[PDB]
Amino acid sequence: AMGSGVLPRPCRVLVLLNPRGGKGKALQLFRSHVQPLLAEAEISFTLMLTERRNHARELVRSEELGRWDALVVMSGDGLMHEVVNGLMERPDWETAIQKPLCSLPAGSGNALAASLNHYAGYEQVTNEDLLTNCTLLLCRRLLSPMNLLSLHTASGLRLFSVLSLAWGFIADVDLESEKYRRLGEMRFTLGTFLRLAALRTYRGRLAYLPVGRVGSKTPASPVVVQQGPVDAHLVPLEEPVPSHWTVVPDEDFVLVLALLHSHLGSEMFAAPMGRCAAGVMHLFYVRAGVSRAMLLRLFLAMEKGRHMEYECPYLVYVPVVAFRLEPKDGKGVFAVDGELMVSEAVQGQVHPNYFWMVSG
Ligand SMILES: OC[C@H]1C[C@@H](O)CCN1CCc1ccc(Nc2nc(-c3ccc(Cl)c(Cl)c3)cs2)cc1
């Protein structure tokens, strides 16, 4: 990528590490693959161990951020999700979210690191090599602003997303592949092959606001947020979507994905059509009708990012600034930056260049 900022030399960083991540070898990996590189780059660090849910969220929320030049997060998409939400929960959120962030991959669920590795111009590497590369980026100190997804649930919960909101097949596999945690990145492949054999479809309603249809006018009364940025494009979930949105006629899906970056994983190049503009995200969905065969061919084609070449008539892609997803019947299972979330309805909008990350 091209840098829009740079960390000072020397600099001190807070390393937030999950010792349970990377099959319980994250600390070992930091010492061998990260620490010696930081010493040569004149980067001071202090390690904080976080192995409980909301723990790093609690820390970042209470932390004196002035001490640090950057916060490096070493676990995966889950922990970066925690840190960012921790920052956004703060009363001083607007300056707090400007604290540069760094993603260092540990084990599985490292799509954000994979994407940054790609922007930098590196080959699609995994595990040891990815960690080295992501550290090399941090050592080269270059910064870039990143889009942020604001989400609202049917219970009124307001959360943020750095990477993705999945629903259907993808979200189901995310959850069910947890009992294959020890297998590494390949658990998504095995989970996919299993769910493919026992294939199911998902009834629900999708609406989105595409880039070209954002006018000068905003809905009269939007969602009133307690704290944080105002989501101007969104209306309350009890209200129907504004008339300029595209309501998807189809209501039978195999998957729906809102994605802010290039990769869904270290070996899943989901978005080869190019990096999103400021305040825009990718939106994919697959309609019921695809065969098990084609679904698999798409999944395997993702490795080298060649899935869009099939021109499958059940796969639709649109760049959007906002979306609403209302699963039919009961509550739906969602993946938010890898993490499980269950809700009756979810909607969100994109906030442009809202936080900074180290990148190439
Ligand atoms: O929740 C999304 C990400 C979050 C990360 O932190 C962890 C990994 N997770 C995605 C994992 C995953 C990715 C893909 C699948 N399965 C399949 N995905 C596809 C597929 C086909 C076409 C497209 Cl355009 C896409 Cl995006 C997916 C077909 S089968 C199952 C699991």
UniProtKB/Swiss-Prot annotation:
Extent of motif Nuclear export signal 1: 143-151
Reactions mediated catalytically: a sphingoid base + ATP = a sphingoid 1-phosphate + ADP + H(+); L-seryl-[protein] + acetyl-CoA = O-acetyl-L-seryl-[protein] + CoA; sphinganine + ATP = sphinganine 1-phosphate + ADP + H(+); sphing-4-enine + ATP = sphing-4-enine 1-phosphate + ADP + H(+)
Phosphothreonine sites (modified residues): T189
Keywords: ATP-binding, Calmodulin-binding, Cell membrane, Coated pit, Cytoplasm, Endosome, Kinase, Lipid metabolism, Membrane, Nucleotide-binding, Nucleus, Phosphoprotein, Synapse, Transferase
Motif Nuclear export signal 2, chain ranges: 157-165
EC class of the enzyme, as a word: transferase
Superkingdom assignment: Eukaryota
Recorded topology in the membrane: Peripheral membrane protein
Entry's Gene Ontology molecular function annotations: acetyltransferase activity; ATP binding; calmodulin binding; D-erythro-sphingosine kinase activity; DNA binding; lipid binding; lipid kinase activity; magnesium ion binding
Record's subcellular location: Cytoplasm; Nucleus; Cell membrane; Endosome membrane
Residues at the catalytic site: D77
Record note on pH: Optimum pH is 7.4.
Name of the protein this chain belongs to: Sphingosine kinase 1
Native species: Homo sapiens
Phylogenetic placement of the source organism: Eukaryota, Metazoa, Chordata, Craniata, Vertebrata
